[PDB]
Amino acid sequence: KVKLFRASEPILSVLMWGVNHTINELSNVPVPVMLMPDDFKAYSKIKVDNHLFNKENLPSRFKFKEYCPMVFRNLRERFGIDDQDYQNSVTRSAPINRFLTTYDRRFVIKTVSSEDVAEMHNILKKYHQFIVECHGNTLLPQFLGMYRLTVDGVETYMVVTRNVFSHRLTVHRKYDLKAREASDKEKAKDLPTFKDNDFLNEGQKHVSKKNFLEKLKRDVEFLAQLKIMDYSLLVGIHDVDRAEQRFFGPGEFDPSVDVYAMKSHESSPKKEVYFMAIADILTNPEQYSKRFNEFMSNILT
Amino acid sequence: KVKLFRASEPILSVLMWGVNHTINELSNVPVPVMLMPDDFKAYSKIKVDNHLFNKENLPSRFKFKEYCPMVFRNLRERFGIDDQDYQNSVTRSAPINTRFLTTYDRRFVIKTVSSEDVAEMHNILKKYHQFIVECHGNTLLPQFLGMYRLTVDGVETYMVVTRNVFSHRLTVHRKYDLKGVAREASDKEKAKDLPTFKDNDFLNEGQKLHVGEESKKNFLEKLKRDVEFLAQLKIMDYSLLVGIHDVDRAEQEEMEVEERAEDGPGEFDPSVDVYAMKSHESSPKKEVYFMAIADILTTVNPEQYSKRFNEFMSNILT
Numbered sequence: 001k002v003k004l005f006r007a008s009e010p011i012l013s014v015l016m017w018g019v020n021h022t023i024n025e026l027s028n029v030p031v032p033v034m035l036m037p038d039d040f041k042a043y044s045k046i047k048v049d050n051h052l053f054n055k056e057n058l059p060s061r062f063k064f065k066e067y068c069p070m071v072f073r074n075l076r077e078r079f080g081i082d083d084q085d086y087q088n089s090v091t092r093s094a095p096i097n098r099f100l101t102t103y104d105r106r107f108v109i110k111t112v113s114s115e116d117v118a119e120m121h122n123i124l125k126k127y128h129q130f131i132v133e134c135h136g137n138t139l140l141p142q143f144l145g146m147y148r149l150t151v152d153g154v155e156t157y158m159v160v161t162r163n164v165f166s167h168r169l170t171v172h173r174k175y176d177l178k179a180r181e182a183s184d185k186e187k188a189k190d191l192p193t194f195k196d197n198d199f200l201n202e203g204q205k206h207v208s209k210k211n212f213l214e215k216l217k218r219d220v221e222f223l224a225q226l227k228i229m230d231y232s233l234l235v236g237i238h239d240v241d242r243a244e245q246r247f248f249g250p251g252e253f254d255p256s257v258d259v260y261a262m263k264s265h266e267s268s269p270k271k272e273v274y275f276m277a278i279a280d281i282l283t284n285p286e287q288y289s290k291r292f293n294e295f296m297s298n299i300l301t
Numbered sequence: 302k303v304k305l306f307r308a309s310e311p312i313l314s315v316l317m318w319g320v321n322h323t324i325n326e327l328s329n330v331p332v333p334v335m336l337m338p339d340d341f342k343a344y345s346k347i348k349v350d351n352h353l354f355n356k357e358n359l360p361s362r363f364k365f366k367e368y369c370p371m372v373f374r375n376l377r378e379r380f381g382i383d384d385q386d387y388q389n390s391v392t393r394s395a396p397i398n399t400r401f402l403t404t405y406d407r408r409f410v411i412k413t414v415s416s417e418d419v420a421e422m423h424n425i426l427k428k429y430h431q432f433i434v435e436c437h438g439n440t441l442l443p444q445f446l447g448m449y450r451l452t453v454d455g456v457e458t459y460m461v462v463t464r465n466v467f468s469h470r471l472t473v474h475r476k477y478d479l480k481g482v483a484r485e486a487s488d489k490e491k492a493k494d495l496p497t498f499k500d501n502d503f504l505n506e507g508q509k510l511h512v513g514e515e516s517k518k519n520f521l522e523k524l525k526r527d528v529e530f531l532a533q534l535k536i537m538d539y540s541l542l543v544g545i546h547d548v549d550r551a552e553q554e555e556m557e558v559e560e561r562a563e564d565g566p567g568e569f570d571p572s573v574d575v576y577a578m579k580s581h582e583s584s585p586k587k588e589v590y591f592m593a594i595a596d597i598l599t600t601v602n603p604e605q606y607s608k609r610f611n612e613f614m615s616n617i618l619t
């Protein structure tokens with residue numbers, strides 16, 4: 001129960017130290033009756049300078065900045081994520097291999113750019129109000145936190161989302177969906193990221209579609225009102241039988257944790273679990289929406 | 302469980318914030334087999350800028366420095382203080398009293414000190430530690446628990462935290478400060494409810510502390526080690542702080558206190574009230590005393606001061 005912050009790179013240690021520090025600080029901050037406009041222009045900044053102290057895993061000097069901590073904490077709640085669990089997932093052991101997941105595979109940690117953080121600030125109020133209005137049920141990425149790490153004078157920005165894939169069920173094939181297809185090198189990768197054409201070709205498909213579609217619609221409409229585009233539908237495929245070849249039954253999962261998961265219908269060829277959510281809304285659009293919205297509807301049932 | 306760090310002076314809020322913050326970080330830092338020489342030049346430093354966030358009680362901007370945290374954690378241990386207890390006394394509720402504070406539960410004293418004071422702590426720290434080791438924590442000396450530097454509105458403030466020389470429960474009805482010439486309470490001092498009396502008062506009122514022979518010896522043996530140690534460090538002009546608790550007077554005071562509301566006695570855990578001594582079963586009055594050396598930090602010398610200081614107290618007791 002002693003949290004060393006041991007990690008491969010020091011920046012990951014700082015991240016671990018950071019999430020720990022801020023989540024603890026928040027536990028002393030009252031949950032407010034509503035977010036306020038300043039909450040969206042707020043930050044926490046902490047600077048550490050430790051001389052001859054506690055430098056076994058942490059750098060002696062580093063900065064850690066959390067953007068809009070009241071907003072992201074509310075988002076956490078609206079996504080049904082407990083702060084202490086969020087903290088544990090980041091903090092209990094180093095994140096694993098810019099794109100990481102927490103060791104328990106529940107949360108993804110993505111390095112991003114100055115402008116991305118700008119774009120997020122740009123959409124945050126609306127994104128929030130929408131998560132409110134849609135009562136949390138949505139295929140959009142779920143933003144759990146956003147941070148700036150300063151290590152060795154270098155700034156690094158990170159965004160934490162909920163993993164689209166199960167944290168336990170092994171994924172057997174990945175499709176990026178918006179003309180485009182998979183490259184040789186990639187087609188020669190342990191887990192290849194296929195694209196639209198490799199899908200219609202593979203005749204790949206089997207369900208929920210009614211509620212997935214009415215959900216996905218509202219989303220893309222939202223992304224249009226924000227004049228965003230060029231984003232994909234990440235689709236995951238877990239082949240139950242394959243995985244099979246004191247128990248953890250095949251195709252078994254906690255829908256409250258693997259939030260994007262749907263089991264295959266009865267009349268489905270091979271028993272599968274699907275993972276689907278919208279990814280990368282951060283960086284004709286009004287048409288991208290209607291186009292995207294239908295290319296997807298043709299991959300269900 | 303929510304701690305708001307509510308306190309009159311933002312400085313106090315920050316003190317609470319800092320003791321809290323540092324104690325938790327220490328909890329994630331393994332306990333070493335021994336202290337290393339660097340631990341005595343070590344420090345932590347944290348600077349906070351909280352923009353439009355979390356400002357009910359804390360300033361948006363402040364700095365907290367803890368000197369030699371490894372050494373002070375270990376000192377706490379040697380003194381039988383648990384870090385959670387310590388943390389809780391500082392943070393559960395604001396310190397009471399700026400220059401001279403007690404934690405809300407009266408376990409710990411927090412005093413503002415000068416930069417010189419802080420420098421003198423470093424000078425003497427390696428030796429003071431060693432001494433605390435070889436006397437097993439058994440000492441009339443001030444028991445140092447933490448040293449800190451707070452920055453609020455660009456203004457730096459140094460603080461040293463000690464264990465209270467007095468009981469955290471038992472009332473003091475009379476205190477003294479003793480050195481060993483021409484010392485006594487001013488006419489202004491006496492005007493206070495709890496006047497701080499001095500050497501010629503203690504003598505001119507013919508006071509004696511009746512602790513009995515077994516205690517008197519155990520006490521003078523401590524004093525002897527402590528004051529010599531203080532000699533070798535060339536340290537001078539420290540006082541013996543003397544508090545007196547009148548058991549019967551207190552029991553009546555308690556009674557009166559309940560009667561107001563409506564409309565054991567002389568007992569102390571020697572592991573908490575560490576300087577306290579029961580009066581001999583043959584004293585004229587039922588009393589508890591508290592005696593400790595105070596002001597180690599800041600015409601003869603140290604060797605003489607130790608000898609003199611020593612022989613005075615020796616007489617104070619029976």
Ligand SMILES: Nc1ncnc2c1ncn2[C@@H]1O[C@H](COP(=O)(O)O)[C@@H](O)[C@H]1O
Binds near residue numbers: 279
């Ligand atoms: N395992 C994952 N869980 C959640 N999101 C992911 C995952 N892998 C990739 N993404 C998102 O998908 C985008 C990249 O997908 P791709 O480059 O098509 O593999 C990035 O914005 C990621 O945030």
Ligand SMILES: Nc1ncnc2c1ncn2[C@@H]1O[C@H](COP(=O)(O)O)[C@@H](O)[C@H]1O
Binds near residue numbers: 341417420424450
């Ligand atoms: N490691 C140290 N050793 C000796 N003196 C120190 C040390 N650190 C600080 N001091 C003294 O403490 C006072 C205030 O220190 P600070 O404000 O931390 O720089 C100054 O008189 C310093 O010289």
Ligand SMILES: Nc1ncnc2c1ncn2[C@@H]1O[C@H](COP(=O)(O)O)[C@@H](O)[C@H]1O
Binds near residue numbers: 412464466467
């Ligand atoms: N209860 C106490 N515990 C520890 N030190 C004290 C206590 N009361 C006073 N002092 C210190 O003893 C010296 C004389 O304090 P005073 O009672 O104001 O004369 C000063 O160094 C005070 O900071």
Ligand SMILES: Nc1ncnc2c1ncn2[C@@H]1O[C@H](COP(=O)(O)O)[C@@H](O)[C@H]1O
Binds near residue numbers: 553557
């Ligand atoms: N048992 C007692 N011992 C000593 N003084 C008392 C006692 N009871 C009352 N007194 C004092 O007599 C006065 C009247 O007390 P009270 O009975 O509370 O009005 C007060 O000064 C009390 O302090």
